[PDB]
Amino acid sequence: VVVRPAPMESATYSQSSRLQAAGLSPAITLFEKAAQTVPLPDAPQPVVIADYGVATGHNSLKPMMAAINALRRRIREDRAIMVAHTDVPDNDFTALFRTLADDPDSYLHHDSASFASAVGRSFYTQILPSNTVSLGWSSWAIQWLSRIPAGAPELTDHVQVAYSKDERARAAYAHQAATDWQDFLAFRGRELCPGGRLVVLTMALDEHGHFGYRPMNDALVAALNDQVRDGLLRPEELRRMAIPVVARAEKDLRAPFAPRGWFEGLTIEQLDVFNAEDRFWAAFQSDGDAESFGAQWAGFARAALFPTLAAALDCGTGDPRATAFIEQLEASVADRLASQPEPMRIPLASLVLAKR
């Protein structure tokens, strides 16, 4: 009965996450800095790094390598470092282990005393032993709600609650996000070693409380309506569609700490809210290729969002009809954005959290 989002499209995520990779780039610096100074476990005990919301692992390679290189300047070369990559049970962990084995950038190919493991359990519960994680990393994951909130009204535009006209929808989604954030922090608070550090990068609202991706939103809503207009999509199926993604404002991120600055042994050591450079727009300004612009934006939306949309269909998710819906939606969104390229706001928040 509890409706959850779908994981990323395993087949395309590694090729369609350049936006995410570019946006998280500043957080890597914070993560490296944290690795330079974090208190370390005693003796030859393995140093554990956790990666919360790994997907295919492609975008984890750079942050993990940065942390590992920093740690190696502090510990013996034979000392074990274990990376625990976490996601939901239905994530494609085979794609992860293939990434870790095949990609030359994989830390397994650069450090002979680094190890990899996977945890397929929602990070809104405790999923690692208490007091074991020296360094935590989570990028582009916590914006995903644990669920479509119980009793929340159907989203008439489907793809983002920030653009909904229903006040009841916004408040339900907002409450779910606050609970999820409290849960995330409580359990990371137990998992981290005393003195441990967790770096979080997530979708944010900007200074003016805006979600961003305005033209994407428009293109996506219109592309969905076109499929019901062309009879390719059923009105009942479209009505069911909702993306459980919530961007948080600065005050939303500070909410669990506000009492006096601490929550379950954790404190915000650093917080930044910024707009990521729109690389797809920048490239378009350089080469003038409109189709490429549309395809890059559409690919980003497909790998991250379309499986969650596809789950609302009457057929199975491994049905030929679902594949056709995915490919058509992508093509339509590509066409709409290519026909009038516009820059987009990509509001992010980076946090460094410390355990006392």
Ligand X SMILES: Nc1ncnc2c1ncn2[C@@H]1O[C@H](CSCC[C@H](N)C(=O)O)[C@@H](O)[C@H]1O
Question: What are the binding residues for S-adenosyl-L-homocysteine?
Answer: 13, 59, 87, 122-123, 139
How much of the chain is helix, strand and coil, in % rounded to 5?
45, 20, 40
- If binding is defined by CB under 8 A, does position 265 make contact with its own copies? no
Of 188 and 248, the one with the shorter C-beta distance to its own copies is 188
Q: Residue 3 — φ and ψ, nearest 5°?
A: -90, 120
Rounded least distance, CB 9 to ligand X, Å: 10
Q: Residue 327's CB: how many other CB atoms inside 10 A?
A: 12
Query: Cβ 285 to ligand X, closest distance in Å?
Result: 25
Known binding-site residues equal: 13, 59, 87, 122-123, 139
* Helix (H) or strand (E) segment spanning residue 323: helix 320-338
Residue whose pair of structure tokens reads 């610096």 in the numeric block: 29
Report the C-alpha gap between 31 and 124 in whole angstroms.
Answer: 22
Binder among 18, 72, 98, 279 for its own copies (CB under 8 A): 98
Total interface residues for its own copies by CB under 8 A: 35
Looking at 15, 29, 36, 94, which residue binds its own copies (CB under 8 A)? 94
Tokens 């190890």 sit at which residue? 115
- Nearest-angstrom CA–CA distance, 115 and 150: 40
- The rounded Cα 320 to chain-centroid distance in angstroms is 27
Question: Buried b vs exposed e over 141-161: b needs ≥16 C-beta within 10 Å?
Answer: bbbbbbbbbeebeebebbbbb
First-to-last C-alpha distance (Å) of the chain: 39
Residues 188-227 that bind ligand 5UF (CB under 6 A): 203, 213, 216-217
CA 330 to chain centre: 20
Q: Say whether residue 310 binds ligand X (CB under 6 A).
A: no
Q: Which amino acid is residue 32, in one-letter code?
A: E
Q: Which residues pair with 47 in a beta bridge?
A: 81
Smallest gap from residue 268 Cβ to ligand 5UF (A): 22
Please enumerate in sequence order all residues whose Cβ is within 8 A of that of 238, keeping only pairs 6 or more positions apart, or say none.
158, 224, 225, 227, 228, 312
The one of its own copies, ligand 5UF, ligand X, none whose footprint includes residue 216, by CB under 5 to 8 A per kind, is ligand 5UF
Helix (H, G, I), strand (E, B) or coil at 192: strand
- Decide whether 144 or 293 has the Cβ nearer to ligand X: 144
Interface pattern 216-255 for its own copies (x via CB under 8 A): ----------------------------------------
* Among ligand 5UF, ligand X, its own copies, none, residue 159 binds (CB under 5-8 Å by kind): ligand 5UF
Q: Which does 181 bind (CB under 5 to 8 A by kind): ligand 5UF, its own copies, ligand X, none?
A: none
Beta carbon nearer to ligand 5UF, 10 or 217 = 217
Task: Please choose which of its own copies, ligand 5UF, ligand X, none residue 213 contacts, taking the beta carbon within 5 to 8 angstroms, the exact cut-off set by kind.
Answer: ligand 5UF
Q: What are phi and psi of 197, to 5 degrees?
A: -125, 140
- Range list of H helices, 192-319: 214-229, 235-240, 250-254, 279-287, 290-310
137 binds ligand 5UF (CB under 6 A): no
Q: Which two tokens stand for residue 39?
A: 């208190």
Binding segment for its own copies among 127-135, 205-213, 219-227, 261-269 (CB under 8 A)? Answer: 127-135
Give the integer Cα–Cα distance in Å for 201 and 204: 9
Site for ligand 5UF, rule CB under 6 A: 20, 140, 143, 159-160, 203, 213, 216-217, 245, 304-305
Site for ligand X, rule CB under 6 A: 7-8, 17, 20, 24, 53-55, 59, 86-88, 91, 122-124, 139-141, 144, 146
Site for its own copies, rule CB under 8 A: 41-46, 80, 82, 84, 89-94, 96-98, 100-101, 113, 115-121, 127-132, 193
